[PDB]
Write a protein that binds this ligand. Structure first.
Ligand SMILES: Cc1cc2nc3c(=O)[nH]c(=O)nc-3n(C[C@H](O)[C@H](O)[C@H](O)COP(=O)(O)O)c2cc1C
Ligand SMILES: O=C1N=C(Nc2ccc(F)cc2C(=O)O)S/C1=C\c1cccc2ccccc12
Ligand SMILES: O=C(O)c1cc(=O)[nH]c(=O)[nH]1
Length: 365
């Protein structure tokens, strides 16, 4: 399509020439929150529908956490064509995050590196903002357009588990699913919450707070993990996830690795790397986690998705849903309908009646 072509060849290069990546992101969140976008050409077919996590998803393509950190553009994101929206990460108290510059474009790699550091308006602000549209969301969700909320922890916090428990209490009642983000590379000590004993203690507390919410306000709880785990780490996560009945996994966050071959001048900036160089590392983490949980723990696959093929590879590896974030940054809004359209064509070509039939198909070969 000409829209996709116009953005890819003209508008996006012009926008990257004019604005640093943080400004462009802020501007994009502002435009999107105002609805200043086309509106979806692409009409979702029934093949794209997925039922998982106690919900219907009209399509399996979501916006990853980090784009709409503070819950300001949710409605414009559904308008862009995403089948579900995840906001956050949200910390209990407001905090500024790291000094700028803290986001970097690696155009030659179709990659970004970021070290935002959980810049967040905080739970109260985000709570009031979601409350103002709570019933509009309840109808969106009933219509197949769910909302997730991704929870983080304050930089100076002296008890991580209590930060996450507060998140559960405050935003849990407004969310279809929560994410316990234990995988940011930009918060000191955070990723060590993924180890066995810490993780079990942490998630036991999270699930207990979730279980004490009223039934209609009780979300699914997912754990978002890194692409950089050891085999031991992964085995331990899978075991805990099964022992506690965690509802799902988000696989993966950004990488602290720098794969060989990066060309961008900014490749040695500190931060998490996203985009194309993360793609297969993420797909393989998905593959492993699905096998370790015997295909019984729903997985939302994320990292380097910019095409229908990218998405279908994660689905066949075991993802029930996918997300993207960095591709939007390079190709703009038209990438959303593009991924959905190609995914549907590939599903037909490969003989799948729908997305659901493809889920984990590589493990049954
Ligand atoms: C600028 C930026 C900010 C991000 N912030 C968050 C965040 O606050 N919480 C989170 O769980 N993941 C965050 N992510 C990670 C994305 O949700 C996603 O896991 C990762 O970028 C891989 O997907 P992608 O290759 O499609 O961008 C962020 C990513 C980027 C690029
Ligand atoms: O040019 C753009 N750059 C974007 N983001 C970024 C660009 C570079 C970077 F290092 C990081 C980001 C980021 O979001 O961290 S988003 C965008 C364009 C649009 C994206 C979404 C909605 C829009 C709506 C209207 C106009 C442009 C956009
Ligand atoms: O710095 C952040 O806020 C952030 C970046 C990132 O890549 N992942 C994450 O979970 N948080």
């Amino acid at each position: 399509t000409g829209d996709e072509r116009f953005y890819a060849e003209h508008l996006m290069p012009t926008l990257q020439g004019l604005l640093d990546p943080e400004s462009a992101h802020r501007l994009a969140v502002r435009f999107t929150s105002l609805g200043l976008l086309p509106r979806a050409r692409f009409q979702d077919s029934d093949m794209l529908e997925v039922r998982v996590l106690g919900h219907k998803f009209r399509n399996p393509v979501g916006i990853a956490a980090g784009f709409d950190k503070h819950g300001e553009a949710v409605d414009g994101l559904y308008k862009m064509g995403f089948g579900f929206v995840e906001i956050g990460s949200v910390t209990p108290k407001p905090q500024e995050g790291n000094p700028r510059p803290r986001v970097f474009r690696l155009p030659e790699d179709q990659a970004v590196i970021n070290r935002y550091g959980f810049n967040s308006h905080g739970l109260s602000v985000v709570e009031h903002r979601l409350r103002a549209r709570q019933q509009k969301q309840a109808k969106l969700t009933e219509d197949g357009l769910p909302l997730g909320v991704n929870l983080g922890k304050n930089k100076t916090s002296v008890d991580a588990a209590e930060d996450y428990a507060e998140g559960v209490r405050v935003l849990g009642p407004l969310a279809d699913y929560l994410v316990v983000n234990v995988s940011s590379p930009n918060t000191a000590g955070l990723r060590s919450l993924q180890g066995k004993a810490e993780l079990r203690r942490l998630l036991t507390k999270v699930l207990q707070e979730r279980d004490g919410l009223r039934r209609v306000h009780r979300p699914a709880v997912l754990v978002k993990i890194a692409p950089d785990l050891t085999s031991q780490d992964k085995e331990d996560i899978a075991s805990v996830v099964k022992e506690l009945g965690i509802d799902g996994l988000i696989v993966t966050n950004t990488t602290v690795s720098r794969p060989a071959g990066l060309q961008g001048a900014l490749r040695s900036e500190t931060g998490g790397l996203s985009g194309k160089p993360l793609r297969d590392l993420s797909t393989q983490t998905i593959r492993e986690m699905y096998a370790l949980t015997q295909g019984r723990v729903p997985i939302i696959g994320v990292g380097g998705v910019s095409s229908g093929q990218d998405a279908l590879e994660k689905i066949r590896a075991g993802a029930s849903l996918v997300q993207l974030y960095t591709a939007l940054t390079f190709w703009g809004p038209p990438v959303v309908g593009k991924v959905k359209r190609e995914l549907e064509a590939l599903l037909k070509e490969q003989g799948f009646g729908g997305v659901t039939d493809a889920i984990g198909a590589d493990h049954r070969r």
